[PDB]
Symmetry: D4
Subunit: 82 residues, 8 copies
């Protein structure tokens, strides 16, 4: 059919930046970290997924989502050319 | 302590029928699968994203990136 | 007793047909796939089960459900003959 | 990516007492167990089906089959 | 403290008797079976546990619950004797 | 097919403080743990039972026992 | 960001003291035990975690929570000294 | 029988931004992870605690400790 049913929807994205004790240092060295909360909905019935993100993990997420954006745009371009 | 961590990101681009379109034009959609590890026992969160939701995601995560880098810098000079 | 309690009930069946990139081809070859959503209810408390179906899996489902139909009809026939 | 896939289908035909029947005639019922794999970690969805629900299921899945085959054909000639 | 909090409560017990095809016979031999549904509540938030019971499993359940009854009565007897 | 089956039954008798008693008399209570197998992957349902709830349980399960035996007998002579 | 999102909140703590038969004695020797119920909330959506606690486990919990208190106070002290 | 037992306790002290503060002063917070075993198959309950919630926790658990010790003593002399 058309798009009437669909996989869960990401409907909220929030975050917090904490300072914590690092694990890469023998001494008392503080390092930042992200707490990320995504709220996901099914078409009501909202769930929350909370993860802890480092800088490198965030950069990798950003690269991946950029590649997804590029693939979506290329498919849209091929679709507009019937 | 071991908070849940995003350890993999996979995706697929599908083409589906549009529901709102008068011209019935097909539309691209992203199936996004995030793999979260908690510790083994990895879970998978699957969502469907449109282009606009992905763009907004990117904007928010870039803001997180900038804030994290600013805090890192202020910690280095502290 | 009689049929007052009962196992969960299938109360909705919906689907979508997507075009995706195939895995059986080295080149860029598109293949269709089904997203099937079944809504299941307990006698209220509705849950959703979404699966991805290929053509062959769908044909096998159809064979199985046909065999179930045949067995139900044979049992009904034996029941009408006391 | 690995969306959940139906990997097994099993069933049993029971005879139960009818609740609506004036004549108290016994009635056949199907216990249907679908095994869904996501990847190991297979889950099982169990439902009870009457003959009419099964018939409607069959009709819907046949419609899916026809639509899938039509899309396949239009992709081959595309 | 006293008994203010408590483990989940069994708040409903229902069942059905089905006839099914047996597994102990090569031929078509029908055998009865029980579908048992227990409804369990937390002190609201009701859940349902459905199991399939054979005659022997039911007899064993009955023996176990009888032994529990005997132990509860013996403890009550010791409590009434301060 | 493999419906969930009760495969173990364990219990403990505790003594707790009574909440309704004027005389504050202690009271026995049963912690009941049913182990259910579905197939490995056994789950555990824990409840708390009073003497009266246990008695009612026993009555209901005895009724199930009698009904099952009657159906068995009518199948043997069928 | 600031503290707008947050991990689940502990919002209730209740308990009961039971007498049970001990496992360290061959004879009939009674021993106390704690049933502890913690109610945890997400910012609505309250869940209950019930555990059985022995005296030694409780003492260890108390030591751990005291160490947490000390670390929180030391961090607060370092924060007040800019 | 095997009721769920708390088998590990881990924690982290973070510094976060305060939301109610006029002076925007940073504030310490505790991320607390309790590991519960039921029997293998250990689960993890994570909460965030402020200093006041921790103090109240400590008071309640100390009351439990005193009650448990009093019952132990009255059992020894029983």
């Amino acid at each position: 059919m058309a798009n009437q049913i669909s996989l869960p929807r990401l409907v909220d994205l929030d975050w917090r930046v904490d300072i914590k004790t690092s694990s890469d240092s023998i001494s008392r060295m503080a390092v930042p970290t992200c707490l990320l909360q995504m709220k996901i909905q099914e078409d009501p019935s909202i769930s929350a997924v909370t993860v802890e993100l480092s800088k490198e993990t965030l950069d990798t997420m950003l690269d991946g989502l950029g590649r997804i954006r590029d693939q979506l745009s290329a498919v849209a371009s091929k679709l507009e050319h019937h």
